[PDB]
UniProtKB/Swiss-Prot annotation, chain A:
Homooctamer. GO terms for biological process: carbohydrate catabolic process. This is Putative isomerase YitF. GO terms for molecular function: hydro-lyase activity; isomerase activity; magnesium ion binding. It comes from Bacillus subtilis (strain 168).
Length: 373, 374, 374, 374
């Protein structure tokens, strides 16, 4: 029934019309790497991962597909654990394919397979790559955000830390003026700062009522500086987008470094370990808001996991964290037909993942095999 | 699916011991079991098991938990269990178990496959004894009770200490050592009898012995810092936590480095999902986890499934999965499911749902008469 | 100079093992090596070596790294290595070596001279084993392997523990102890097999034995406080950190007193300049540093240069510089650079550049055929 | 090279101040400077600079350091500098400078190239003031003196506090604030005048001001935890460490989280390589580093080379390298090298060696007569 018989892979690539950036620099293209695992009985499932395409593609064709062929698709935990040793990026796409196969074989949704959802709607924030290579970048950023406010998003993430304090403050004042205090604003510094540089924002944090949090102001090599900065700031501190699993969050949580952890399904070892990241935060008494700069199919899994998470508070209408919703130019958001209405996502409830991968997008963006660069 | 809960049946069971046996908390005079059967619209059913004082347990189910469950969707396990947790902690595990059976039968797979597939099919167990008895010859009764289990190929045992003077406990353990020898692993369970100085008196023996597996719950857990202090001074691992209600209670113990081994019990934690989370929390922290199970047959089977679905704790080809406790004291409820170790290993059922049936003969024979032992 | 990189050559190498060997992570089936040759406008060239799965590595060079390097000034070594590190940390390492050779030949001096001159000309090494093999007779094979290298006049060895039970591992080490005797230093390498309690089991032999150099990476590194706790309980030093990418990673460990000895690896950290920083960091912390080098030949030569340029860690006239790891298992790549210890001491080449030549016969013989090992 | 040291010349220099100035340690009455020139066999030479009381500095060099240095290999810089460090801290730095210049020259490259290549060629600087003068009009003079340098395009300044009442210093700093305005970065240097309570009195001003670069050395360094406590209470960064002898002294300050910015002085640490290690060490700890240079011109040039070779501390495209200290008080030795800011930026010379020459006119003009000041 569930022996693995065939696996198809789909490296996808899109060069950006107009580049955009954060403190790490300008982005020039978006990529994505889908796999389809098919079992003896015909039951199939899809997974997604992200990494530089030439290496990722050879990893799959030379090692992972060779290894998965003939294996029992029902031995999810075991197979993912073995791949995680060679290649953690791939383990995650594998774990998602295998879950969809489990759900379908069980004749239920992924949410049901995990023990039933708590809710049908998940809040998301609009996430922007605020810089662009234009002396008019501030005014482009304002236009961009305006556009999304019109769509009814109530929360936003924008970028700081890539130009001087004076310049970034000017930008965020400009956003405060347009947005107003009913819009929650998240500021992401992409680890540009040290504690003293991040502390400069405190004089603005004191007077602003709408900052949702300050994201990764620092690098993570010194956990004690995060616990120090966090104790000095008037807004929550979030982070952890690059952590590989619950084992790396534990010492951060034990050391009270963060208000909000931010695992990414495609950065951790599998959708089972990602769900463990979320519960772990629940058990430490801290929040968890999934990170998803890249992600479409994996973003659907973060949505299913968030729907199966118990509330973090007793507040009747503020008891579950939003998930990140990239709103920049990215044709891979349409790999699955699912988009927020007024900043809420309505979770698919049909069998499997309750929706289909959109082959027009898969075929439209087939990687031609050459390196940009 | 959208299938509703339509009936729940309850089976309180009771057995008065022929000969009492004990630990540091005193003599046990009886054993008990409380089973439930949840039946859905489609006739799919599942069983759970819990333990607590029978009269209060029985009314928790009949006057609140069952009335609440009737009409609910059996597939809403996470949510139903979470609400029940708030009214009756002990009942949540039983409910969670029975909904898990339902889920696995509904999906036409075993419990372990529901969880993502097992890593192994054999789980090691230790023989767990209530070594105190009501008699001046209790040391010798202990020794032959132990002897009798060693003949069945158990390679590890748990015996009790802290119930009597240090001197007399030493005598007993010394006797067991002379009989068992260095190749049997010995766990000493103090049942929270000691303070740090009292526990430490054992260290002059832990120095010399080479087969002590761990020292179990030497102290109460009010002061976590006293564990990390004791742990640091002793030559054997310290285990504990059989009363913790779930992973949120373990987290500060493991942050403070209080324990080498945690010991969650299915029927003491918040549901089988939370129980699995305790085990994985232990792995994320780098500590071992060996399930506690003084009571339990059906819940112990779930602890076996959980352990089978847990990654190894070490890279030792021969020693990378923790044992689970196997109570070997008189208890007819050990047979509620027909599964027993052979040479100190239990082979996991692979069939659909729980891969096994509950013995209705034992159910009816030990039906509780509804009267309190006192 | 303003001098530009005009050509880059790549040499991935592969060798399938005749007899597998291993550690707690399992058996090794092949060894590989990846060299590069960077050629400048003036014809000055420099070589580098890295390690990683070859399909991926090869494509990273041919598709990203080489395209970026062509036309860059070979003299902007810090700047270039830092760029490459963000993408590909393994590759930056090979790149830094190539550029360092070029700097030294352009300056008409040796690498050590380029760095301010060596403190010494001889560096001690220890013979390093992959002790496990696919055999019921693996212990006596390891004993025979160890005997052989001891006749070469190695005075220290590292062997593997953690891959099988504590009792079997101890039989292995006791066999070694009987054959070597107490004048040979023995390092035990657990490869992150253990948790603190399993590691601590060795303490009762540590107390008795007098020739243990250190216990190597007994635990994973996710919980630094577990290292600090364990280190405080053992009678031998603790060493680790072969997987750390650079000084930044080591700082929290050292602040928290996790380790007696840090073990950076040239090919695991971000280039040779950061590796040397990992060394000095240790000296500033008052802790020892002994380079890791399971794989490595050309890059092991750089760890040798770096050790020769390192201040003494002690005032002991004849015990003041740490040894480096010398892999003694079947590896034809040990001969890419023609350099071997005598009686456990390596005598550093003193000539221009790296003061030695790469053996092209080995490059040409072990050319990778392009396929993966299924 | 095996090229030997054949000749060392020394140049004690002295200038009496036309008008004194100072800080909380009192008024300065003269400037000194002490150059050395080391000549090798092949006739490649190099210069170094140090500072201390001339009489003792002079006999140190003439009777011990010079005798030791003749006949030695100019290439053994690490080794030679380490030995000197033992008897004469301050002299080691001047020697390490000369030998570096010799090294680059023999390499046919600049110093920055020798170190692995610059990241950037312009370095920001701050105008550094000794704000107290012997006069009841000292405030309006400070204001004037500051104004003259703003007119020259410095965008950052350091001034002295802690030598008079809080009330009087605040009046001086308010006047400075009002003239400079919020586009000028102001640094307040307390020269260890205060305890934590007196430093904290400033916080109510720091609350309001937007342009404070940092509070420098507000306390003595005997109690690192008091720096950690203070740092955590103030609204502006804390810097210090100008008298640390090297990386090993900064390490516990950084592990304890005492400082936002360390300030090693090339002439206070054990040589230029050890100085580079201080900067790199701040990087690895996630802290900033801003070179101290009250005295210094040749040494300040090396401090400038080192900063050009340091990676960025932030991802801010316009704000990612720390400025360095530029003394703007009367001192004729600022022209020993012909290098001056333009609009608060120094463009780094790029020629071979130090890429500039010592101005012998200055050297000859200020020859010390051998007398001691009163
Ligand atoms: Cl590691
Ligand atoms: Mg982020
Ligand atoms: Mg217990
Ligand atoms: Mg190692
Ligand atoms: Mg100062």
């Amino acid at each position: 029934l569930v022996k693995i018989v065939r696996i198809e892979t789909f490296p996808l690539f899109h060069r950006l019309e107009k580049p955009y950036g954060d403190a790490n620099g300008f982005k020039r293209y978006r990529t994505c790497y889908l796999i389809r695992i098919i079992t003896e009985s015909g039951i199939d499932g899809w997974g997604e991962c992200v990494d530089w395409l030439p290496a990722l593609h050879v990893g799959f064709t030379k090692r992972i597909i060779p290894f998965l062929l003939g294996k029992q698709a029902g031995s999810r935990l075991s197979l993912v654990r073995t791949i995680q040793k060679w290649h953690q990026r791939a383990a995650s796409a594998v774990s998602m394919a295998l879950t969809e196969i489990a759900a379908k074989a069980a004749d239920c949704s992924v949410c049901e397979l995990w023990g039933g959802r708590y809710r049908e709607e998940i809040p998301v924030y609009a996430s922007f790559q605020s810089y662009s290579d234009s002396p008019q970048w501030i005014s482009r950023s304002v236009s961009n955000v305006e556009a999304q406010l019109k769509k009814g998003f109530e929360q936003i993430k924008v970028k700081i830390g890539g130009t001087s304090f004076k310049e970034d403050v000017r930008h965020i004042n400009a956003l405060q003026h347009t947005a107003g205090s009913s819009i929650t604003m998240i500021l992401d510094a992409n680890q540009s700062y040290d504690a003293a540089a991040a502390f400069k924002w405190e004089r603005y944090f004191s007077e602003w009522t709408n900052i949702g949090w300050l994201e990764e102001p620092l690098p993570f090599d010194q956990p004690q500086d995060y616990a120090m900065l966090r104790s000095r700031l008037s807004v929550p501190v979030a982070g952890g987008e690059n952590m590989k699993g619950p084992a790396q969050y534990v010492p951060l949580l034990s050391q009270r470094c963060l208000d909000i952890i931010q695992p990414d399904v495609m950065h951790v070892n599998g959708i089972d370990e990602f769900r463990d990241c979320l519960q772990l935060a629940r058990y430490f008494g801290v929040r968890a808001s999934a990170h998803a700069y890249d992600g479409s199919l994996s973003r659907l899994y973060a949505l299913f996991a968030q729907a199966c998470l118990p509330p973090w508070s007793k507040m009747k209408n503020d008891h579950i964290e939003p998930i990140e919703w990239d709103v920049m130019e990215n044709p891979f958001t349409d790999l699955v037909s699912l988009q927020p209405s007024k900043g809420m996502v309505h979770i698919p409830k049909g069998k499997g993942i309750g929706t289909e991968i959109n082959m027009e997008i898969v075929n439209r963006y087939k990687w031609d095999g050459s390196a940009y660069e």
